């Protein structure tokens, strides 16, 4: 129900802008958005939470943004280790996170 | 409401315990020379000494009679690079003092001269 | 720090009910929720539910409303801020369509709006 | 002018005695172990203790160094339904304490948290 | 910079020493009954008494927690007819106290009632 992006890529030095949106059920103005860097079949990683706040240790090139209808995840200054699958997820303070479909970068 | 008591929020988050400061503030201060009498007199002079050393530092920082005073000394990230949400909504005041313990003397000087210079600036502004 | 070693990656067949273990270290096990996340192959990653090692209060997705039993045992104090805990996961009317890698992840913060958020994950376990 | 001396306005009206507060304020604080020496040492430690207990309450109310500080705690008429003119131009501070004595502990808490919350509001206002 | 130490600017000009006040401010305050034990206890009770007598005068003048507070008492030239440049850029704090010593008690009363009346005026202004 939280339709992410199909996929895309850039190049070493450029940037990416992943998307994430849905209906009034899981998006957006009354929900927070978190983005997980999730290699397939491995331990995931919390990149940002609360729409744009990064986790401790996340590179400043990772940036989040939430419009009134869609949340974005920019990945500036690409590096080799960025070839992973990213997932957004929407949540409130007293619920669970409805993850997104997925996006191969 | 809650009212956890004296030191009741010692295991609570720093942001939670920062709302019950009067609880610990009021318990910081409240002759025959026998073995018990000498013992009690030492407990009395020690309490007033410890209470006034903290009030002295609170004075040379421009924080007299304040439970929460804001300063002008910026936070050198070399002290703690943690963010606000992972400090006030995560750590407790006990473990916070455990990792800020090395730099507590560095900060106590920056607040001391920032107040000495501020009161010198305030006198210059009221000189007209 | 913090670690969440998970159980073995053995396999069973439909109709059964397996238990998944998650052993914690390097952090106070009572201060953060324990989340159970599923990464199936024929579906997007799903959040199954979190439970409170401190209050015992559990909360799971309605897709696992009456099929999953989440339990945690009390922690063992190692130091003032370090303990060891364990979290358990079970399934009821189990088939072979729930196949995938299962993870356990502790909460993010102790207070705020991102309290239970799966922050520190385990290595995962392969299933049927 | 007048200058009635230390406690000179103890029989005066509350509004009259409220203008001679510095008179009583400055007299609140101004080794051989013989029978007189132990006696004098007890008189010294007792005076500093009593003086600092009042300065402590004056601090947790936001009244540090104030002879007359105004608060935000409204006057519950169940304490005393008397009017202003029949209090300041009628009663003395002695008999006033005699009829407000029951509620002096109730008021001391309302002033204590009104200051704890005010300094929490002031920090939020200077956060921008 | 400089940092002359405790009393390091005792021979410096009044304007120079007026910038190193925190140096002297922090050194104003920092049980077996043997001949040394009775000696040390007297040193402890004496220090807190002398420290609080100055903080008391600093309070009845509206100067609580201030190293440099400005008052409303005008300078009666009969105290010292010297000009500002021949005081702050000439005299030392030692010799200044030597020639202002006679009138130090006169000034201590003018500051005491100027604060008592100011707080009476502030209450009247907040009565609307
Ligand atoms: C000791 O240490 C423990 C563990 O660290 C502390 O427990 C944690 O406390 C914090 C803050 O109090 C909790 O964060 C809050 O989490 C709630 C989520 O719970 C809500 O949802 C539940 C499931 O949906 C629901 O069952 C709850 O409703 C009642 O039921 C339980 C049954 O056990 C009952 O115990 C509850 O008290 C409820 O009465 C509950 O509604 C979330 O709602 C909070 O968000 C609100 O508050 C924050 C500010 O706190 C605010 O920013 C938000 O906008 C929102 O308004 C908040 O996130 C945490 O869940 C607790 N558990 C952990 C971390 O495991 C304990 O407080 C410490 N005590 C002391 C004295 O130190
Ligand atoms: C101890 O307790 C006693 C008794 O309670 C107190 O005495 C009372 O003091 C108050 C305030 O000081 C008095 O109220 C004032 O009353 C005067 C009225 O007197 C005037 O009129 C007289 C007749 O017309 C006149 O003779 C007076 O003139 C002089 O003569 C007498 C001779 O004895 C002399 O004693 C006087 O001192 C005069 O020098 C006098 O002018 C009234 O004028 C006052 O009103 C003014 O002041 C108020 C503020 O106080 C102000 O609001 C008004 O606008 C106005 O400006 C005031 O009402 C009271 O009369 C006294 N007697 C009682 C109550 O029986 C005594 O003060 C207490 N002392 C201490 C130390 O506690
Ligand atoms: C103890 O007591 C002594 C004696 O009273 C004090 O010494 C006096 O200190 C004051 C302030 O510090 C001095 O006033 C200043 O005078 C200088 C003039 O010197 C300048 O010019 C020299 C010749 O042209 C030059 O050589 C100097 O340059 C260096 O060389 C000397 C070599 O010895 C070295 O010692 C210097 O330190 C220099 O590094 C020097 O540049 C004048 O420039 C000052 O004016 C500036 O500062 C004032 C404020 O102070 C400001 O208002 C002005 O606008 C301008 O910016 C200032 O007038 C005085 O000359 C000293 N000697 C006396 C009085 O005989 C000593 O300070 C006391 N110490 C303590 C700890 O109490
Ligand atoms: C932080 O402190 C160190 C010394 O402790 C100093 O060298 C550095 O310049 C400071 N940096 C900032 C940003 O304050
Ligand atoms: C404080 O200093 C000690 C000195 O040995 C060091 O071991 C410790 O890591 C320091 N802590 C911080 C937070 O700098
Ligand atoms: C989970 O398992 C425990 C094992 O003793 C059991 O007591 C408990 O009732 C189970 N939970 C539910 C909801 O049945
Ligand atoms: C006065 O205090 C009583 C309890 O002492 C309380 O029940 C009442 O609501 C208060 N009323 C007002 C007006 O403050
Ligand atoms: C205070 O409490 C006592 C308790 O016996 C009571 O007799 C007295 O009337 C009370 N006074 C007031 C002013 O409420
Ligand atoms: C100075 O003080 C004297 C008494 O010490 C006084 O008579 C005189 O009026 C005062 N003058 C000024 C200008 O304050
Ligand atoms: C202070 O008083 C003494 C009294 O003998 C006098 O000798 C001295 O000159 C006076 N000093 C001043 C500055 O008035």
Domains (ranges, CATH) in chain C? Answer: 1-128 (2.60.40.10)
Cα(first)–Cα(last) distance of chain D, in Å? 50
Which residues of A are less than 8 Å from B86 in CB distance? 56
Residue C40: count other Cβ atoms within 10 Å of its Cβ: 15
Instruction: List the one residue out of E21, E112, E17 whose CA is nearest residue E68.
Output: E21
Which atom belonging to ligand 4 lies closest to the Cα atom of B78?
A: 1
Instruction: List the one residue out of A26, A13, A18 whose CA is nearest residue A47.
Output: A18
Rounded to whole angstroms, what are the CA distances from B97 to A15, A19, B61, D114?
40, 41, 19, 28
What's the reported resolution, in angstroms, to a tenth? Answer: 2.6
User: Using a 6 Å cutoff on CB, does residue D11 contact ligand 2?
Assistant: yes
Residue D81: count other Cβ atoms within 10 Å of its Cβ: 8
| Residue C127: both structure tokens together | 């299933």
SS3 C83: strand
**Half-sphere exposure (CA, 13 Å, Cβ side) for A8?**
13
Which residues of C are less than 8 Å from B85 in CB distance? 109, 112, 114
Question: How far, in Å, CA of A6 to CA of A31, rounded?
Answer: 23
| Residue A58: both structure tokens together | 């996340």
DSSP H or E run through C59: strand C58-60
Question: How far, in Å, CA of C4 to CA of C2, rounded?
Answer: 7
Question: How far, in Å, CA of D60 to CA of B20, rounded?
Answer: 12
**For residue D102, how far is its CA from the centre of ligand 8 (angstroms)?**
6
SS3 D63: coil
Residue reference for tokens 């910038």: E19
Rounded to whole angstroms, what are the CA distances from D44 to A8, B75, D56?
80, 43, 19
Question: How far, in Å, CA of C33 to CA of C54, rounded?
Answer: 8
**For residue E16, how far is its CA from the centre of ligand 3 (angstroms)?**
12
Instruction: Judge whether E64 is closer than 8 Å to chain D, CB to CB.
Output: yes
Q: CB of B113 within 8 A of CB of E22? A: yes
Rounded to whole angstroms, what are the CA distances from D99 to B43, D79, D85, D89, D104?
35, 9, 17, 16, 10
Boundaries of every domain in chain B: 1-128
Question: How far, in Å, CA of C85 to CA of C96, rounded?
Answer: 30
Q: Which residues, 6+ apart, have CB-to-CB distance to D55 below 8 Å? A: D64
Method: X-ray
User: Using a 6 Å cutoff on CB, does residue E81 contact ligand 10?
Assistant: no
Q: CB of E92 within 8 A of CB of E12? A: yes
Question: How far, in Å, CA of C4 to CA of B104, rounded?
Answer: 34
Helix D35-59 / helix B35-59 crossing angle, nearest 10 deg: 40
| Residue D8: both structure tokens together | 């000179």
Cross-strand partners of C125: C102
| Burial class of C37 by CB neighbour count within 10 A (0 to 12, 13 to 18, 19+) | buried
Instruction: List the one residue out of C61, C40, C54 whose CA is nearest residue C115.
Output: C54
Contacts for B78-85: CB closer than 8 Å, 24+ residues apart: B78/B103, B79/B103, B79/B106, B79/B107, B82/A56, B83/A53, B83/A56, B85/A50, B85/A53, B85/C109, B85/C112, B85/C114
| Residue D128: both structure tokens together | 């921008």
Q: Which residues, 6+ apart, have CB-to-CB distance to C94 below 8 Å? A: C14, C15, C16, C17, C18, C67
Which residues of C are less than 8 Å from A25 in CB distance? none
- Identify the DSSP state of B72: S
Question: How far, in Å, CA of A18 to CA of A102, rounded?
Answer: 10
- Identify the DSSP state of A82: G
| Residue E14: both structure tokens together | 């009044």
Give E30 to chain D, closest Cα distance, Å: 17
Question: How far, in Å, CA of A37 to CA of B64, rounded?
Answer: 49
For B104-127, b where at least 16 C-beta lie within 10 A, e where not — what string? Answer: eeebeebbbeebbebbeeeeeeee
- Identify the DSSP state of D89: T
- Identify the DSSP state of E48: H
Residue E38: count other Cβ atoms within 10 Å of its Cβ: 16
Instruction: List the one residue out of B56, B53, B58 whose CA is nearest residue B69.
Output: B58
SS3 E85: helix
Question: How far, in Å, CA of A55 to CA of A61, rounded?
Answer: 12
What domains are there in chain A, each with its CATH number?
1-105 (2.60.40.10)
φ/ψ of residue C63, rounded to 5: -70, -15
SS3 E78: coil
User: Left, alpha or beta for D23 (phi > 0: left; psi -120 to 50: alpha)?
Assistant: alpha
Return the CA Rg of chain A: 13
């Amino acid at each position: 129900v939280l339709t992410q992006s199909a996929s895309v890529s850039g190049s070493l030095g450029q940037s990416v802008t992943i998307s994430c949106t849905g209906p009034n059920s899981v998006c957006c103005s009354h929900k927070s958005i978190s983005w997980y860097q999730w290699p397939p079949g491995r331990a995931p990683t919390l990149i940002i939470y609360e729409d744009n706040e990064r986790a401790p240790g996340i590179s400043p090139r990772f940036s989040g943004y939430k419009s009134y209808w869609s949340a974005y995840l920019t990945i500036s200054d690409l590096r080799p280790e960025d070839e992973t699958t990213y997932y957004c997820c929407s949540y409130t303070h007293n619920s669970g996170c409805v993850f997104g479909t997925g996006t191969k970068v | 409401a809650v009212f956890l008591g004296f030191l009741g929020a010692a295991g609570s988050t720093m942001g939670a315990a920062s709302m019950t400061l009067t609880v610990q503030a009021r318990n910081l201060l409240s002759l025959k020379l026998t073995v018990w009498g000498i013992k009690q007199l030492q407990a009395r002079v020690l309490a007033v000494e410890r209470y006034l050393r903290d009030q002295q530092l609170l004075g040379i920082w421009g924080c007299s009679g304040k439970l929460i005073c804001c300063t002008n000394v910026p936070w050198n990230s070399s002290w703690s690079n943690r963010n606000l949400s992972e400090i006030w909504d995560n750590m407790t005041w006990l473990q916070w003092d455990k990792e800020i313990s090395n730099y507590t003397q560095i900060i106590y000087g920056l607040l001391e001269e920032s107040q000495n210079q501020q009161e010198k600036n305030e006198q210059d502004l009221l000189a007209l | 720090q913090g670690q969440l070693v998970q159980s073995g990656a053995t396999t069973t067949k439909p109709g059964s009910s397996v238990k998944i273990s998650c052993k914690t270290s390097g952090y106070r096990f009572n201060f953060y929720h324990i989340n159970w996340i599923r990464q199936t192959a024929g579906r997007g990653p799903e959040w199954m539910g979190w439970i409170s090692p401190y209050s015992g209060d559990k909360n799971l997705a309605p897709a696992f409303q009456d099929r999953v039993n989440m339990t945690t045992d009390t922690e063992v104090p190692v130091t003032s801020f370090t303990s060891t805990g364990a979290a358990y996961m079970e399934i009821r009317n189990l088939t072979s369509d729930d196949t995938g890698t299962y993870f356990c992840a502790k909460g993010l913060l102790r207070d705020g709006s991102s309290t239970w958020l799966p922050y520190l994950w385990g290595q995962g376990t392969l299933l049927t």
